[PDB]
Amino acid sequence: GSHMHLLPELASHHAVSIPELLVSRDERQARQHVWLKRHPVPLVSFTVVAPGPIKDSEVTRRIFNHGVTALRALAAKQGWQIQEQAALVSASGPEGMLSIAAPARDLKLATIELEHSHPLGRLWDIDVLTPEGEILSRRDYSLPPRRCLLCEQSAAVCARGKTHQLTDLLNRMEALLNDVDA
């Protein structure tokens, strides 16, 4: 476990290379599996939308810190115990892990609702893994796919189609943060 709030002014602004990000996804899967073996309960694996090479910034830390607060409030409201929790900075930027003694399907459904209904939920990537390592998905419940941050089409096809400009994604992140932290 660790403290989970990341001081925004201490952002590293680490520049992530393409192979560094590719390696990190295998490291993240291994780290997830360690947590599932230490505490055999569902795991929340939380990252923030962080486009471009610099993923640990004052903006992404501020977004992340709101998400930590919301996830802790979700667990308390649903009556689920957090058995362990930690935050780190990876090649994906701020990253949170929470082992939660909840039913895995209930937890994923709750985080889907959080991503939809919190004003900053569009900027959160909240994964939920079962103790067998299954990554749960909106598709498992026949729910519509996650929408693109900037339009009504699915985020997957706008990402694959490189539809939107990096600057426009970053500027929307700033604008949403300013809208909540007036």
> Which residue number places its CB atom closest to Zn ion?
148
Number of residues that bind Zn ion (CB under 5 A): 4
Binders of Zn ion among residues 137 to 156 (CB under 5 A) are 148, 150-151
* Residue 73 makes contact with Zn ion by CB under 5 A: no
Token digits for 83? 């058995």
x/- map, 99-138, Zn ion, by CB under 5 A? ----------------------------------------
Cβ atoms of 87 and 5 within 8 Å: the answer is yes
CA distances from 140 to 9, 58, 109 (A): 39, 35, 10
Q: Smallest distance, Å, CB 147 to Zn ion?
A: 8
Residue type, 18: I
Q: Smallest distance, Å, CB 52 to Zn ion?
A: 17
Q: Smallest distance, Å, CB 161 to Zn ion?
A: 8
Q: Smallest distance, Å, CB 156 to Zn ion?
A: 10
Distance CA 29, CA 16 (A): 18
Q: Which is nearer to Zn ion, 138 or 172 (CB)?
A: 172
3-class SS letters over 133-165: CCECCHHHHCCCCCECCCCCCEHHHHHHCCCCC
Closest by CA position to 65, among listed 93, 29, 91: 93
* Residue 158 makes contact with Zn ion by CB under 5 A: yes
Residue type, 174: E
* Residue 173 makes contact with Zn ion by CB under 5 A: no
Q: Which is nearer to Zn ion, 36 or 148 (CB)?
A: 148
Which residues contact Zn ion (rule: CB under 5 A)?
148, 150-151, 158
